[PDB]
Amino acid sequence: TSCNVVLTDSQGSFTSPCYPNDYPPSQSCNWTIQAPAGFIVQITFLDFELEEAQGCIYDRVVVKTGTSDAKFCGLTANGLTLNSTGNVMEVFFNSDFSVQKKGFHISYKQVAVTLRNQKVTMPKSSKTILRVSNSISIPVLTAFTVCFEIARTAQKATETIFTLSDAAGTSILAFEKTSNGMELFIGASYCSVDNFLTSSDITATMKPLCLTWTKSSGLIGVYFEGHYFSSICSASQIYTLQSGGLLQIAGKGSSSVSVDDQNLDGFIYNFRLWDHAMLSSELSALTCDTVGNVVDWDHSYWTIPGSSTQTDSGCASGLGCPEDIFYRSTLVVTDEQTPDRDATAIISQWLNQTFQNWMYRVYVDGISLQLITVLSRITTTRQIYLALLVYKNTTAEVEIESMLRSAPAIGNGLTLDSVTVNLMENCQADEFPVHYRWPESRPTVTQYVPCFPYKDRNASRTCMINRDNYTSFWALPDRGNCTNITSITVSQENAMDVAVQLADISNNGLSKEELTQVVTKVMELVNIAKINATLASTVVTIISNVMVSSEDAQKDASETALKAVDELVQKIEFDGPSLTISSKNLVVGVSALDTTNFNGSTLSAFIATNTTDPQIDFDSEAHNALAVVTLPPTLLQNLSLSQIEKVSRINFMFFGRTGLFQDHQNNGLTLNSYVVASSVGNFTIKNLQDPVRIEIAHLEYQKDPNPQCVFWDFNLQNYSGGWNSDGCKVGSDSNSNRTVCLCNHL
Amino acid sequence: THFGILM
Ligand SMILES: *[C@@H]1O[C@H](CO)[C@@H](O)[C@H](O)[C@H]1NC(C)=O
Ligand SMILES: *[C@@H]1O[C@H](CO)[C@@H](O)[C@H](O)[C@H]1NC(C)=O
Ligand SMILES: *[C@@H]1O[C@H](CO)[C@@H](O)[C@H](O)[C@H]1NC(C)=O
Ligand SMILES: *[C@@H]1O[C@H](CO)[C@@H](O)[C@H](O)[C@H]1NC(C)=O
Ligand SMILES: *[C@@H]1O[C@H](CO)[C@@H](O)[C@H](O)[C@H]1NC(C)=O
Ligand SMILES: *[C@@H]1O[C@H](CO)[C@@H](O)[C@H](O)[C@H]1NC(C)=O
Ligand SMILES: *[C@@H]1O[C@H](CO)[C@@H](O)[C@H](O)[C@H]1NC(C)=O
Ligand SMILES: *[C@@H]1O[C@H](CO)[C@@H](O)[C@H](O)[C@H]1NC(C)=O
Ligand SMILES: *[C@@H]1O[C@H](CO)[C@@H](O)[C@H](O)[C@H]1NC(C)=O
Ligand SMILES: *[C@@H]1O[C@H](CO)[C@@H](O)[C@H](O)[C@H]1NC(C)=O
Ligand SMILES: *[C@@H]1O[C@H](CO)[C@@H](O)[C@H](O)[C@H]1NC(C)=O
Ligand SMILES: [Ca+2]
């Protein structure tokens, strides 16, 4: 359950948290994938869906290799395959406070760098064989083309470039520069190619070279420097290169015993071998990427160790895309003419002049003297300067140090002793204020985050440059377009939008002070708006989510929450004979009541087969019910005609959780029940002659209990609310699992 | 009217 890991296996998989369900809000993940020194990392998104935003400013995935940085959201990374330039690939993921999608499933893979990005040092000793691997079977050859790129360090009279020895060990093909220079040794004969190349071309610049041969003519072909050459080696028409041999880089050549210090010194690249000898027309359509027919420059064909492989030859970033790159430098200079000049003008113009002598657009944007010490002569000071260099409009520090170190003569008597240059540090990722999570940023980048919690507009923060000691700092956030939880003003037109956003935040771990602000806004929303089903389904799950909060979080907000659910049920407009609104800890229901034919009613709360949410039976007592409410047939009997025409509906609520009904004046009695509510309108029917049968299931077992039937009286404890016993007695059907109440009011 | 059982 950890998403800040370092993954070191050869291949594997990782997902966003809770994939394939939705990720949680406010995530911050850092999967760093590390391979050893000769490998790169390839990732592949197997699946990807994030919350979309302009500039990916809500939820984003950043993919970081050694040279680039790119942010992704929406669906845009879904079929993608990305490749690290070094051996480390880092994948970040950040979600904000609301709106979650599915996330992602990424496969990672350690991939070796290709042999065609590597040159190979050939050895000086033996028992260091750099051979074609035994995965490859070298056929019988009566014709071949071999091409490679060769380059050298030192010179020697006898040196070998490749060696094919047979299954018994004696050499049968070798290209080696000899007593007579450049020669192809074939079978037992010597075919000199010296008129078309020799060892004066073992330059340290690489150059391609092709050698061809056929048995049938004896025709050696040489391709070098764009020109094709031909020569007949008539001795070579006797020989056939047999199967199953050992082809190796450098190697023994035309020697009987040893290869020990009998090899060329240098680099080789792109060694390939073919079954046929190529024409000059065929040798001119030969790119360096074409696969060799027997041996190709590709790691599956060779056993070459890592010790002999080198290498040669809107805004997309989540950090921001600034116009200028900034550097801070520390210059140590020696002035031998301290009383004459001001060295800051001379140093800054030398600084401006030196970068423009290498055609770089780097300029000084600020410089000041930090330390001045005389030395032995009183007119010679060592002066320490702090300077801001700015790179104008480019997509390394040690190169800036070396262009300055290679020009120490600043002015006459002015001399650079030391310089260090540091790239100016990014502003770190930082949460200020709470729910405003600002990502890491380059200097002068402004970042935008959503306004908590409605996200209608943005806030912004800028990573600024302190122009005194040339370090970066976060400026203050501009939250001027942002609204509080409380400060929005609800309308009929924005009520659906407000309720949806507050329903998102309430799944998260909220503070107790945020929770009473959500429940006050829900009360304003339920009061001003007209309520249909989809608006009430959002409001019931704000209240269901505050029911799984801590008991101290609910306690200040519970009476507003209870009163807002109560008025939502009075105001809800529905079309059928009944409407039920369910959630995890709260189901509320309305059904229509005919006051002419009212012969009584039984209503019931239950949870069905592999359902996690409770439902409402309006007609019967459902099987294994958690709450049953039976209304007597004489319920409307003592009602006036003015009251009986205000009776349209039956209301029913089942509270799966009890944290909204806390009572600290209970004499230590704990509430061991669900809470069920019922009513028939905006008024309470009192002093009935036949009671309401309220049966509620207990939370826990209690053998021979002493139950007290209570109702929630909103007038108790200075109009805050408490349980009240008045009117409610225990019926005779109560056991250890259920309690039946007969209450005389509803 | 919300109903509970105290024990
Ligand atoms: C990500 O993790 C790696 C290894 O734990 C660490 O070196 C790197 O600095 C981390 N970066 C961020 C931005 O968390
Ligand atoms: C590395 O990634 C790119 C996609 O950007 C892909 O085209 C390329 O083939 C990959 N490299 C290898 C060796 O497969
Ligand atoms: C260094 O270059 C900047 C870039 O235009 C310029 O404004 C500044 O005046 C130059 N400094 C000196 C001492 O000429
Ligand atoms: C919020 O920022 C995005 C870019 O990140 C921009 O497209 C949009 O116009 C901004 N909206 C407001 C209200 O500032
Ligand atoms: C606030 O709104 C104004 C006008 O709509 C806009 O110009 C400004 O950039 C916004 N501020 C932020 C931080 O988005
Ligand atoms: C110098 O840098 C430090 C940290 O980098 C910062 O706290 C301090 O305020 C800076 N000095 C000035 C004068 O701003
Ligand atoms: C947000 O709430 C605070 C709470 O004291 C209030 O003072 C402030 O005026 C509200 N914000 C706005 C922009 O009205
Ligand atoms: C709910 O009522 C509002 C107005 O009170 C109306 O605009 C909206 O279409 C209704 N929605 C549904 C799903 O009935
Ligand atoms: C019920 O009565 C109270 C005041 O007695 C009022 O605030 C509330 O809006 C009424 N309910 C409906 C649905 O009108
Ligand atoms: C209700 O009505 C019945 C019959 O009409 C009567 O006997 C009873 O006393 C009345 N009860 C109250 C509380 O008004
Ligand atoms: C209900 O009672 C039965 C025995 O009558 C018992 O097995 C069961 O555990 C009880 N259930 C609860 C939730 O107390
Ligand atoms: Ca989100």
Residue numbers in the entry:
A (entry chain A): 39 to 351, 368 to 376, 400 to 472, 477 to 827
B (entry chain Q): 828 to 834
Article sentences:
Gpr126/Adgrg6 is one of the better studied aGPCRs and is essential for Schwann cell (SC) myelination and other functions. Gpr126 has a large ECR consisting of 839 aa. In this study, we determine the high-resolution crystal structure of the full-length ECR of zebrafish Gpr126, which reveals five domains, including a newly identified Sperm protein, Enterokinase and Agrin (SEA) domain, in which furin-mediated cleavage would occur in the human and mouse homologs. Intriguingly, the ECR is in an unexpected closed conformation that is reminiscent of the inactive closed conformation of the ECRs from EGFR and integrin families.
To determine the structure of the ECR of Gpr126, the full-length ECR (−ss) from zebrafish Gpr126 (T39-S837) was expressed and purified from insect cells using the baculovirus expression system. Zebrafish Gpr126 has high sequence identity (47%) to its human homolog but its ECR has a fewer number of N-linked glycosylation sites (15 predicted in zebrafish, 26 in human) and no furin-cleavage site, and thus yields a more homogeneous sample. Crystals of both native and selenomethionine (SeMet)-labeled zebrafish Gpr126 ECR (−ss) were obtained and diffracted to 2.4 Å, and the structure was determined by SeMet single-wavelength anomalous diffraction (SAD) phasing. The structure, with overall dimensions of 110 × 80 × 35 Å, revealed the presence of five domains, of which only four were identified previously. The 150 aa unknown region after the PTX domain was revealed to be a 22 aa linker that is partially disordered, the 23 aa alternatively spliced region (not present in crystal structure construct), and a structured domain which spans 105 aa and was identified as a SEA domain through the Dali server. Finally, the SEA domain is followed by the HormR and GAIN domains, the latter of which is autoproteolyzed as expected. Unexpectedly, the structure revealed a compact, closed conformation where the most N-terminal CUB domain interacts with the more C-terminal HormR and GAIN domains. As the closed conformation of Gpr126 (−ss) ECR was shown to exist both in solution and in the crystal lattice, we next wanted to explore the interactions that contribute to this protein architecture. Close examination of the crystal structure revealed two interaction sites that mediate the closed conformation, the first of which is a direct interaction between domains that are at opposite ends of the ECR and the second is an indirect interaction formed between two domains through a loop that holds them together. Residues in the HormR domain (H516, F533, P534, Y535) interact with each other through pi-pi stacking (sandwich), promoting interaction with F135 on the CUB domain through additional (T-shaped) pi-pi stacking to stabilize the CUB-HormR interaction.
